[PDB]
Structure formats: C-alpha cells, structure tokens
Amino acid sequence: VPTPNQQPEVLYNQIFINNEWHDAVSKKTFPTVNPSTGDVICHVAEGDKADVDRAVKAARAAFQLGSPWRRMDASERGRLLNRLADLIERDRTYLAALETLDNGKPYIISYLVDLDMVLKCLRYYAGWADKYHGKTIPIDGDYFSYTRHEPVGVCGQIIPWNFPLLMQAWKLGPALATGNVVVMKVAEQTPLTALYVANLIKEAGFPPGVVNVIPGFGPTAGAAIASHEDVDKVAFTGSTEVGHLIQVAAGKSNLKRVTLEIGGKSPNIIMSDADMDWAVEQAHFALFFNQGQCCCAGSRTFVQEDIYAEFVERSVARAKSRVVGNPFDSRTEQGPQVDETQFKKVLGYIKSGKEEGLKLLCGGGAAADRGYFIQPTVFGDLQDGMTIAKEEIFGPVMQILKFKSMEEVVGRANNSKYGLAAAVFTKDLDKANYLSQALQAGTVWVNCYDVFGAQSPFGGYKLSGSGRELGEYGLQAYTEVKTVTVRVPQKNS
Amino acid sequence: VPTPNQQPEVLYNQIFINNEWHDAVSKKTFPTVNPSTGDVICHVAEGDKADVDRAVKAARAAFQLGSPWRRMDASERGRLLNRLADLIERDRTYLAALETLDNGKPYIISYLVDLDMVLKCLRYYAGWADKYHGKTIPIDGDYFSYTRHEPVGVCGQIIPWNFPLLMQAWKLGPALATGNVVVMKVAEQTPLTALYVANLIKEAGFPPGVVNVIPGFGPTAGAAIASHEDVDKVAFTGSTEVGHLIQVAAGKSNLKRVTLEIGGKSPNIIMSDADMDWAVEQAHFALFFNQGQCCCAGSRTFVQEDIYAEFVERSVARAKSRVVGNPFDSRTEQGPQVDETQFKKVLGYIKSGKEEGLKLLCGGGAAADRGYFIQPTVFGDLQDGMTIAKEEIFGPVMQILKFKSMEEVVGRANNSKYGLAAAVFTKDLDKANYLSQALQAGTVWVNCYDVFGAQSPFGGYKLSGSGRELGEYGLQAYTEVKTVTVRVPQKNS
Amino acid sequence: VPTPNQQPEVLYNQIFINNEWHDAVSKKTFPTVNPSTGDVICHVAEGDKADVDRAVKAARAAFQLGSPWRRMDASERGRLLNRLADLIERDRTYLAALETLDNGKPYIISYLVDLDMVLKCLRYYAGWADKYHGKTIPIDGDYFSYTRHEPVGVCGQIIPWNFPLLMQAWKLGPALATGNVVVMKVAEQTPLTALYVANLIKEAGFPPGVVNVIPGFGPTAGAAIASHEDVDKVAFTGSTEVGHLIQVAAGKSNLKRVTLEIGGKSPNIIMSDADMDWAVEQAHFALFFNQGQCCCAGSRTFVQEDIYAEFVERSVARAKSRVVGNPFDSRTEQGPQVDETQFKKVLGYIKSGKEEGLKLLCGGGAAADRGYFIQPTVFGDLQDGMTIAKEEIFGPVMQILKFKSMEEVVGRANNSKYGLAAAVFTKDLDKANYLSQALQAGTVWVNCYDVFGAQSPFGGYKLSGSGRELGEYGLQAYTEVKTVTVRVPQKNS
Amino acid sequence: VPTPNQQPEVLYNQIFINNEWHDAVSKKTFPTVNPSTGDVICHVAEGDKADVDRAVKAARAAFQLGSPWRRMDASERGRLLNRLADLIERDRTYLAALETLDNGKPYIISYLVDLDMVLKCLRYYAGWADKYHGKTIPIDGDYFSYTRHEPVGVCGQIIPWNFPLLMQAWKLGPALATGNVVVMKVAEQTPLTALYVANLIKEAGFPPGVVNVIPGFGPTAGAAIASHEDVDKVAFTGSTEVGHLIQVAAGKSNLKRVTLEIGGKSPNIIMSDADMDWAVEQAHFALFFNQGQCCCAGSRTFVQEDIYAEFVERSVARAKSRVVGNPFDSRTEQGPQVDETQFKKVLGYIKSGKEEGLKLLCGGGAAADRGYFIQPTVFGDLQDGMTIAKEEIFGPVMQILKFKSMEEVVGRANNSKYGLAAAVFTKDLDKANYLSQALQAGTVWVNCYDVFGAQSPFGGYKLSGSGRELGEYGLQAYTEVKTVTVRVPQKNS
Ligand SMILES: NC(=O)c1ccc[n+]([C@@H]2O[C@H](COP(=O)([O-])OP(=O)(O)OC[C@H]3O[C@@H](n4cnc5c(N)ncnc54)[C@H](O)[C@@H]3O)[C@@H](O)[C@H]2O)c1
Ligand SMILES: [Sm+3]
Ligand SMILES: [Sm+3]
C-alpha cells in the first residue's frame, strides 16, 4: 500500500452541476471536520432546494430524447464507466487518503477495501450497459409484442457517510449503466471525496447534466430531491427514520419510484459445531468493522450455550487487543467515529446498556481526549428487551446473547423490525441450509460475514429497506419497461 | 354464448377469511346496486379495520414457515391456480351474468372478453409457479453465492370496479404463483363476483388464510390495509388521487413495498397514412370500451389535419350508431355507468367540455330515465388546455384533437402527468418505430388498441403508476430476494 | 394404488402419422414380449425408412408457415399439453399396467413413480409454451435489434426402453411447448405405451402431423431419422455406442442439431460422517432402482474405509431381503429385466466380475426359470480396472469400492469416460460443497439419489451426453434464434 | 485514420503454446503471401497433429481444478479481456496495416471497421465474465436444487481468412469470458495478425496454457483438433463442405460439442416501395463488401419487377465506379482477393454464369496483372437454377433476380440449403414484419445490411451453421451445466 499524504489537498468543494463548479445560490458554506483531530478540514458549499432545482433542470435537459446521452450507445456508456474507474484507480492513493481524512477509517482499509470495492463496482456495471435486454413476448393474436427497458428518468440519489466513495459507486453504477441522469445529495459529514469523483466524471467524458453532485444537509437538499415534482426516482441509503420521510415525500408529490437501503440489527448465529477461532474473529469483524458503523453489522451475537462462556472470553480478549488510533498509522485497526454527534450517540448507548443491566466486559468510554475515539465495548449476557439489543448502535459496541435451540434462535433472531442481514457459523450442512432459509434477511452469510460482491444483491427485508442494490437486481429499480404491441398481418411461431 | 340468467342468485355476500364466511365485526352491511335499474341487488358485509386485522392475522398464520402453503411445492401452487381456472370456467355463464348484473357491462362482453381474460390470466400464472428461478452468482473469492426468490409475505391488494373479476385475477395470479398470502379489498360498487371466486378458491383446495377477500369501503377497509404494520406489500389499482394516499400510508407505517396501477389520459395518434376504416373503429373502441371506464382509454385522439375532418365525420357517425341499452340484450354495445356518482361525474365533464368551448358533435346527456345510461358523446376541435382534454373522464366521452407534425404530436402527447398507454396508427415502419420509442407510456399499441396479454406487462410512466402488472414482470413485485453467500474450501469456475 | 388389470388390452399397435394408424409400408410386424413370462404380448408394425420418410413429410407439412400449428397461440400449445396430461391421468391405471406388462417394472412403481413423473413433466412444459421469451438487444447505432426464438423445425426423437412413457414425455414436453413437430422412434422392446399416448395426442386435439410415433428397430427406423435430409434436429437417448452413430449420421447428412443423453457409471461417494441408515438405503436404491436399469445408477459405491466393512455388511443384508417377483404383486420390489438379451447380458457381467476376482457377496444368478429374473447381486472390494467397475451393467449388480481420502476419491470418481451423475453423502457443509464442484457430472445428488425434477436439468459431461434435457434448459435445443436488426430514424435509450 | 506503414514488420511467425513461441515439431514452415502483389510476406511455422497434441496438453493442464485460471475471479477474467482490448487498441495502426498486408482488404476498412469491431467484441464479452449466472430451481420435495454454469473444458477453435482478427475475437471473447481454455487453428492464408494478438494475450497477463494459437493447414492441424480425444468442444467457421467433416470427426471420436458457422447465399429482397438511392447503395455494399468475401453477403438480390430495370441500371453504374486498387490507397474501395486459389475460383464462377446464360452487365475479368484483383462483376436476370444463383461465389460477383409477389419471393428466397442471413428493404410496416418472420435466416436486416453488433447473435438456419455466435447466446456453447440437488431438512418457499 502506497504511503499516503496525511494531509491530502482538497481541490473541489462546491456544487457540481453541468460539469461546472459553482457556489450555492445563497453563497453559504458548511465546514467538514477530520474526526481524528476535530479540526476543520475545509468549507464546502451548502446546497439547498434552489441548487437542487437548478440541478434537476440540468438533469432533465440531459435526459431529453435526442440528447448525446440518450442517443449514446449502451456500449459507450460502459466505456465511460470504465474510463471513470481508470481515473479513480489512477488517483487511488489520493482518494484513499482523502477518504480517511474526511471519514476517519484506517487508510489501509480505505485503500485495500473501499477503493478496491469502488473500482470493482463501477467496472462491474460498465459491463451491464449493453446486456440488460428487454423481451419479445409470444402474445395471443396476430401481434408482435415486445418490451423496451428504458431509463426511468431523472434519478435522485441520497447517500450516508459510512462508506462515502462506495455508496456513491453503488448508486452511480446501475444508474449510469441503464442510461439514467443523476442528481445526487452527498452526506454533509463526508462530502470531499464524492466531489473529487464528480470532477473525474467530467474528465471521463460524461455529457453535461448526466451526473450532478450537491453537497449539503439532509432536511434541506435531501428533502428537496425527495419531494421534487420532476425527480422520477429516488434511491435512499441512510436511517430508517428518514426512510419513512423519503417514502412519505414521494407519495405526497411526484409519486416517484422509491427504493430504500436502511438500518439494521443483524443477528450473528454461532452454533456449537462452529470453528471457534474463525467464528470468533469473524464475529469480531462483523460488529467492529468500520468503527462499528455498518448497516449490516452483526449487532446481536447469539452464541449457543455450550460454547457461550468460551466464545465470550475470546471475544473480550480480541476487543481488548483491537488497536484504536490514528487512521494513517499502519497498525491502527479502529479510527474515530465520523463525528461528535455520532460520538455522543454511541456513548449514550453504552450508558443505556450498563443501566439496563448488562455485563460490560470491555471498557465503554472514550479512548482519547482529542478525536472522537471510543473503546471497543463488549456487553455480555444480553436480553432481547434491552435497548442496545433492539436499537442500531452504529458504534464499536458488541452485544452477546446466549441461545439453546435453533427453533429458539430462529424465532429470536427474526424477532426484529430490521432484516438487512444475518449470518450462520456451522460445519453442518443441514443446519446451514435450514437457517439460511429461515432467517428473514436480505443477506445471510454462512461461515463468513460482510462479504460484498458487485454481482450479489444487497437489501432489507422489513424496516431495513426495499429493493436490492447490487448485481443484475440493481438495474431493475433504474428501468422503466415499455410494452409495444404491433398488429401484424399473420403471426406464426 | 350461452343464454344467461337475467337475475343470477347471489350466493355469497360476507367477509371471506380462512376459507369461511363471517359477517363484519360490526354486523354492518352496505347495498350493492344494479346500474341498469338503480335497484339494490343485495347487501354485502361492510368490512373495516377490525376485519382487516383479523384477515391479516389469518394471512400471517398461513405464511408461517412450515405451513402447508409455505411447504407446498411450487408445481402444486400452479396446480391449484389451474384448478381455480377450471372451476371459474365451469361457472362461466353464472359469473359473466353476475358481473353484468353488478357492473353494467354487456353480458356478451363479460362472457367473451372478461371471463376469457380471467381464465387466460390465472392459467398463465399457474405456469410461472415453478419457473421464476433465482440465481447462482459468480462472486469473487472462495464463496458460493446464490439468490432465493422468496415470497414478500402478506400482500394487501386493493382493486377498482371497472373489471371486477379481471382486476382480481390480475392480483391473485402473480401473488399466489409466487407463494404469497393475500388480504384483498374489493370495490364497494362491485363486490359480488369477487366473493364468489373467493369461495371457488376454497373449493379449489387452497389452504385457509392464503386468500382473504374483504368487501367494504375505501378510506375504511382499504386504508386499514395500506397502513397496516403487518402487511408486507400493497398492490393498488384505482385513482391517482388515492394512489398518493396509499404511498404516503406505506411511508408513515410499515414501509411496505408499494406498486400502483392508476389513472390515465392515453393519447391515440392517427397519422395520415393510417387505414381510415380501421383507425376509426379502433379509435372508437379505444375510448368507448367498457362504458369508457378504462384506465388506458384513448382519451386524446390526435388526428393529423390532412384527415381530421373525414376522421371526425366517421367518428361521430360511429358514436351515433353505438347501441346503449340493457346489458343482457345481445345487441347492446353500451351498458350503464357503474353507479350514479360516476353518472353525475361523467355528465359533469360533458358540461365542462361544452362550457370550455368545445364542439359537441354527439349528444352529451343521459340516454334513459332509469339506469345510469349516458349518450356516446364526441367532442371535436379540442384544446390541450381544456379540462376534458386533461382530466380522466372515465365515461363515454370522446375527445378529438388535431395535429400537424410528428415532432409536435410527440410533445403534446407526452404533455401529461399520466403515462399509462398510447397508440399510433400508421402503415409506415419508421413512423411506427420512432413514435413507439418517443411516447412516454407503459404500453404503446401500434395499429391496434386495448390489446392485453397475460404475457405482456402493463403499467404507468408517471402519475399513472409504478411497477408492471403482467407477464414475468408481474412476479417481481411479489418477490423478496435473499442472497446466501457460503464460504467454500476452494472456488473454481 | 388402484388394482390393475394383470392383462391390459392392447388397443394400438401400428404406426401413428397424421393422427392416423396404418401398417408399415412392408406390412411387416415384430413381436413385443412380456419379460415376466417370456410370452409374446402382441405384434407391432415394423416401421423402416419408408415409413420414416412418410412421417417426415407429414411433419414438414404440419410445420408449414401458416399451418394451424405454426399459427396456434403459444398459450394454446400449453393448453393442448395440459389436455394431454389430463387424458393420461384419466388412463393412469391402464397405462401403468400396460407399462409394467411390456417393461417388467413393478406396477406400483409404474403407477406412483413413472406415471406421476410423466404427468409432472408434461404439465411443467405446458407452462413454458408462452414464457420462453426472446430479447430486445441494445445494439450500437441507429437500429432496433431483437431476437425471435422460433421452432427448430422437424424434430426426430429416439428413445430407449427403460422408462418408455417417461422418456417419451421428456422429449414431447419441450418439443411441443416450443412449437416444433415430431417424428418419434420408440424402442422396439417396449412400444405399446408410446402408441397409446400417441392416440391420446390425437384425442387431445393436436393438429395432424405435429406428433408422429413410429414403432420399429434401431439401425432401421432410428438410423433413417438420424441421417434424414429433412429432419432439422435429432434428440437421442440410448447407448453411447449408438450415440457416436447418431452424431456421425448428422454430420454425414443434413448437418442437423444433435443432443445425446446416453450411458453412465455414476459414482456414489459415502464419507465416514454419512448417516449409515440413510446412506445404505439410498445406496441400495441408487443402484437397484428399476431392475438396475437406470442410466444414472450409482454403479460405483465408494465407501470410506472407516465405515466400509459396516456399510458392506448392511448393503448385502438389504440386497438379500430385496423381493424379486411378479411386478403385479404389491410386495414385489424387483421385477424382471426387460428382455432375454438384457438378461443374458447382465449375467455375463456377473460372470465377468467373478472371473476378474471379485467378492461375490450376493448370489449372482437367475432368480427364476420363467421370466427374466436376476438375483440382486453385490460385489465387494472392487478395483477400478475391473470390467464391472468400468462398464455399464444396467442390471441389479452392485459394485462396492473402498477409498481413503477425498483427494483420492475425487480423482477416482472422475476417472471415467462417462459423466452423467454422482452423489455424495455427508453431514459436513465443506465436504458437500467441495465434492459437488469437483465431480465432473451433469447431476450431483447430496444426501439423496435419483431425485428428478421437471424443473431441474439432466445430462452428461463426457461420453454420457451433450445438452440438458429438463427445466428451461430443455427448451434451448428446440429453439432456433433469429436476429432482426431494423434501421431506425434515431435510436434512444 | 493514421497513416499506416505499407510494410509492417512481422514480429511473430511460430506456434504459440504456454505463452511461448516454438517452431513446429517438424521444423516445417509455409509461406504467407500478400494478395496485392503475389510476393511472399514471410514464412510461418507449419503446425500439425504433434503440435496440436502439445497444445491440447498445455490447455488441459491450464484447465486443472485449482489452476490459476480455474481459481481466478470471473471479474478478473473480464479484466484480462479488457487489458487485451487496450493492448490491441494501442497497436491498432500496426494491426490494421498487418491485416491488410496479409489479407488484401483496404487499410481504411481494417482500421475503422475490423479493428473497431475487434475491440468492441472483446470489450463486450469482458462484461459477461461475471454475469452469466446459473439458477436456483424450485424443485419438488425437500431439496435445494441449483445449477452451475461451468466451462466446457478444452476448446478447439478453427477460423477462416476473410476477417482474421475479428474471427479470432468472436471465438476468444466467449471462450475466455466463460473460463474456458483454447487451442486455436488459424487460417493458413492469413496467420500473421492472430499470432501477434497471441503475444498480446501473454502481455495482458493471461495464464500460460489458456490460449494456444497454432498456424498451419486444414486437413492437418485443423482435423487434428476436430478428432482429438481430449478437445471437449469445437467451434468451426469456414465452408459447409468442411463443416460436415468437423461434425463427422466429433461423432467418430470424443463425441465433443460442435458449433458451426458456415457458408451462405443470403437473399436481398427489395420491394417496390423501397427508397431506391439507399436500397441501391446498400445492395452494392451487401455483396461487394470485403471483396465479396463475406459469409452473409447478399448474393441473391431479388428486385421487384416494377423497379427492376431502374435498380439494375443503378447497380451496374455503382459497380462501374467501384475503385479497385492498392489496399493502402485512401481511394481504394476494393482490394485483391485473399489468394490465387480464390482468384481463379471466383473467375470460374464468372465463367459459369456467362455459360449458364446470364446478362453480364459488368466486366467479369481480372482487374490487374499483379495481385489477385477482379473487376466488380454484375449479372442481370438470373435464374434460381443457375450455379452462380445457387453456390457461394465469395468474390465481387453480383446476382440480380426479379420477383413479382411476396408470396413468390418468400418461397424462392427460402429455397436454399443455406440460411445465414437475409434482408428486406421496404417503407411498409406490415411487409417488413411479415417478411422478417417468413425468411428462414439467422439474421434478417430491415432497411440495412451487414449490421453486426457484439450484443446481437449471428448464425445459420440450415447448411449454413448451427448455434449462435454473439450476444449472450455466444456464451451458451461454452458452458457446461451442472445440477446439484441437495437434501434439506425441510423445504419452504
Ligand atoms: N441419458 C438418458 O436420458 C438416458 C435415459 C435412459 C437410458 N439411457 C441410456 O440408454 C441405454 C439403455 O437403452 P437402450 O438399450 O434401449 O439403448 P440403444 O442404443 O440400444 O437403443 C435405444 C433407442 O435407439 C434406437 N437405436 C438402436 N440402434 C440404433 C441405431 N444404430 N441407429 C439409430 N437408432 C438406433 C433403439 O431402437 C431404441 O429406439 C443405456 O446407455 C442407458 O444408460 C440414457
Ligand atoms: Sm442525520
Ligand atoms: Sm372512490
């Protein structure tokens, strides 16, 4: 991994509309902070409804029948998505460092994980551009019926701050591959990298208006997109709380298509026959990954009684060794929580757990006096009714529950409003299969966790979402089907 | 066509839950009227939230992992759907007669069109039960990734009164084929036929709880389903106005999946090289079909100037010959409008058109003093800004507009909030191709209209809906994808 | 199971062409024998090239563009396939008894297994008729490219005698569902049942010429189809030896499409962790099923040393209790071998095994002096180089080999020219996964054997075939793709 | 178009096996000639059975389970294909020049057409690598059935000389995208470019043994692959004559999978309402393109009598202006015929036509005394029974036939053993629709010709082939389906 620049230059910090950078109509700006220090990195333009409106107009124009983007070859769309990937790889070290600076996650991770996954995502959807065929349908009568899978139109895409570059990639990949136009609202906590990529979009040769990126706040620029009378589809990734708002906004207005990838409280079921060493390390990763700031985190580790104590002993030991520190330090495994708000938020949960009567196995407190660092906390002997066993903590706080039978664990694991993911650690074939099928989750990892693939769909089962976001499934939400039934002289098979 | 019984006996008039008939919790009932006479056919149980809740519980139970329906083989689901089809065909004369008595549409149509389309739909989806495969995905790393296309859960389906039996079949086919459970709310204006088929479902051998039919009112039983914390998905077909409500209800509550098949103001573009005889008859059919009570009706007939006068003269002549009368009379082409409220509503539009300054070419008034009959009205020389040229009349009121160029007609045709369908009559290949691609509609009929096929998707492009309802596409909304990524010792191609 | 008629009346015994029964052009006939007695059931007309040519002519005519069959709705094709299934079910008792009478297999099997699987197959493909869509392709340039999945043409289908009715159904289902015409050659050992179904085809309402069934001999009628200048595609199921002949014939002549489903030597790998009770019973079933006359039979039972002795002991015990007798007796598990030729052939193999130096664990000799009955033989301590461990015996002769490691078993199991199927019995997830992927077989059963599903494909990996025969895959070989690229004034997404 | 090097350096002229260049086992070589001069470009190694065997071994090893290639991620396969495309583009000018030097086609065409199509094809299939999913099948009973789309194995691919680089790309694209290994036999008349790309494969980072290129002769190296006991599948593109041989070879040997892309005699139907200017130029292109050396050339131009005379007059004038000359001259439209053998072969046909009694409208003779140049010949008033109207000329010799009705032209156009392509020029929608469905051709071009797209399949209907070569269809032939049915404790929907 290339040596990063612990202070990457911030080259772009405005609103990107029509391959041009401009300030907010109000000239307002908001600060972005480096979570590791608490110092302001720079000031980004504060987009609002006016800027959203301007962007939507730009996007609508770019989507007009006969525009370069509409007329462009599907193959060339894939070409552009690949060119974008190339530029991103060219600037891999810069983007990784900027990501870590803006987000807090370990540089090594931003580089080897995030950027790799961004590249693999864009490159994956570049190949889908000219392969998402429609169908010729054998209708009754003397007709020739077929379907056109055309773009849904102007797509509003709102993303969170946990995986800035990646969440952007997840949205842009299928949207652009299907020939859609975009008006994206990036998280105010981490806007720096998306803006840089926005410029790479221009450099890649994307037609003006195709991708519009607007930095700003939620109920401001985000809501402006959600209830816009000219945004055809909205893709939202964030809190379940805001998810409700997004959906309600669509109903009250444009009646635009909605897809939501939201919160979770994923159960991590460990059976007695599970390989301990593996089950332990993966259980650690499943929850602490990305400062515990992951939607599909295994927030409820259900360990079978026969191995509970042992597992617990090992989980605590691993949490005890987990190195928290400067994101840029090669040996730092845990960086700071994205921001103070999230910092105090997490601590509030640690407080709740202790108060509701939980076995605090690892120190639940700040790890430093400067950045927003929190100690890898592990709570033992959890009860389903406890807040920390119900609510998404989104911080390095592990919950370890004990179960006896599978009949029992299935019911318990499924007893949640969330249903984004789950995992099963077992050596037995039948137990793996039975559980996979019984768990009401968008993704069930067997003998592993957090395994993401551009080719495999991701999504929620209940209040954790609707619609899938990767693979061929990711193209569906970005397609408007058109049936054309033509009368023919005489139909034949 | 078998001679019907002008007065079919109403055998079922209660709430169907768990293969059993019960009265409403409140014991309240509401009358159902025969639009041809204005007399009450009988009184149906008035379902409300309480009944909806009891139906949802029955549905949830039927969906329980390990229940007969869950464990049932996909093939047997197809068997049950076919069995249902057979029983419906067995009772074809009865159901067509009852349909006509409760709805108003001509008996010949109920029999040859509706009932035929009902059978073709169910029989089509019976074949999909065991064929909607999931996928094995070539993911990166040593894993085995695949997807499970599982049922979405408890499906709430709300249908209108224009095609009672058909709208029900449109909903039940894909829902049942995919292994889902149903809580259906039937239109208060025409509940009788749905209830009969409800019992046929029991007789077919469908497990109790799988399909629950609730007769009642909209803001009552309908809203109860839309905002239910235990209904996983809602499928709505009705007005765009109510559609907003359905979507907002979902966001404020369960965040359930939503699909909307709503209103329209479909344009019927007639080019000068169109075969007159055909273009005229089909343009007549396009708007007057089913008492003009059709979502995708060609409510805006744009005739190219070069043939405008001639076309209009023939349109009016055709309207003048259109026989309005007793739906049971074999020569009756037009029955009465579903109910007085719709009656008064249609006349209100004829009034608007006149006042807005339109060429009333065919008498716009009642056609009788008994039932709810209205004269096949034809308005000529319409202007896009006129209400009747903007709003969905849903009655036998034809609007004929004139255009010069295609560039112009494309823009005008597309100038609408709706986008459910459209059609183009031409002998020219390039004009057919160009327009079909240019019209923002879920269905574009070329040289025909109202051609529906169980195998071809149907849906709206803007405020006319979201999601498709037929063909393979009709299965999507009823599927919940599950990605199972299993770690393997060593992956190989 | 309905009490059969020990002596079913043979109603049809000629050549079926154009919904009509006629004798062979030569008026020749050949006898069909009841293997349980050795007595002639009746005499069937002997078709040859002359009759095949007449049939092909009939088929070609029925395939003419504009014929009722070509113009027929895809849904109607499905309707006809369903009608055929219904009639077959109506005559289930008769067909089962006739099957047993002419084949030898136990009546209970013919009824509960064969006939059920025939119904399930036809019913499955009925649903495929109107669902095998083509595609609209997003080609570069101003074009509208799409594909038509049309019938391949005149299909010659040659079947074996092991599962008469079933093999017929496997061929007819996909052929007719895709709109093709048929020229079928039925096994001279068991032509009776196929002929009866042939007439049910007529009764179902199938257009004349669409399905032509020709009873006769191999190098006679079979070869006549194989090298016919007007047969578009040949589907063969038989011996690997004849398979070579069929493909060579195609290349020599019409260059028609070829698919072969041939012989096997399927390995059954039982690992130490396997549940004995089940592994032993399924291992018994995997080999002895249908008088050991099954292409995918587990002809090489590789038992892991740690449980070899124990396993063998039980295999033998089960072999010893295996009831061989009158197919019509409820207690009969094993009927006679199809015919004398196969009887002597099987005995030859038992002879071989003994001479090759094998542990004869169960008597390898005739079980009666009347019909063609053979004692369920079990050979222990087999060596890969032994003929009985190499060649397809096709009789109740069990081979039990011993293995130590997976690495070793994989290589050994794969060391065969055949590759039709394999099975793995384990409780371990990783072993199941690893083996499934490592075994070069068209079907790998895990913890079960001979599990067939109309929805899952079946086929060979090497000298055991080419192409798949069930599920959606079974439609491929019966489809001819046509790309239509039309010039459009202006292409848009 | 960059100025080429009229004498590009030949850097590679040996056999490529294991990313290494070696001479033939016999040390024999054969000359490769420049058709424009008749002078020898250089000497290439003459591969034979021995070298094929060597290559097969290399490929077999590269395909071993656990190999870098077998273990490689499908995405990485796509990455390698894209890497190869980049290297090919990097050397576009060199490759174009070398292609022209060894083939004879105009440099401008090699550059803007051939190389462009080469890049487009490879880049297209790069995207397929991780997208050709298998499926999870809803089988009956307590099982989990799914399919694995695995590589077929060692693929032998034999290509002709008309589009050297492109034919290679058509084979390599799907083969490599699906994870297969290759043993390719390149045309003795034009081996130079394939060999250079062979080295670029090495440079791209492809594992050794994955692609082996062998220059040599047909009945020698070609047949050695066709009848190899270890080549799992053979893909052939060449003459129908040799096609028979290839298929026969497969049947006599390994029983390997076969796909043939062979000769044609495509009809070009021009209706009276066809735009003359366009129909005339397209008709010219359709036959003369690539020195008339194109499999799907419109060698039977059926002009509707009403426009016959006029069309012919225009066709002749066009042929009369067609510039034949030095392939490297910007003004050259027609280069020399690949080789003397083909040169005399074409002249033989011109002699035939004259003798058969045809209207020689344009000089049917050599165009120069140096290279292999032939004058753009046009024969008028052709009769279906004439040799030149039946046999593939494969040179610049146009056949113009006259027809009266559609019914007539359909039957005539279809009266051929070939069925590779066809075209229809009409302004009428119904005529276009009717004919497209009526013509038995793998591709029917409407108002255009020779329009190829990596996304749309190409193939023959009769003696012109079997199987398709582009789009998703191109992956089918390179996939081996494996059904894995696992027993599960309890199956649920
Ligand atoms: N893959 C499968 O689906 C499948 C299924 C069942 C059986 N089989 C295989 O079939 C064989 C058992 O059946 P069989 O003894 O009847 O096979 P067989 O080769 O002797 O003959 C089978 C069919 O082909 C015909 N035929 C025979 N010789 C012919 C020739 N020279 N040219 C053209 N047609 C000819 C026969 O008359 C009969 O109709 C075994 O190899 C078994 O494994 C395969
Ligand atoms: Sm927030
Ligand atoms: Sm209402």
Ligand SMILES: [Sm+3]
């Ligand atoms: Sm034989």
Ligand SMILES: [Sm+3]
């Ligand atoms: Sm040759």
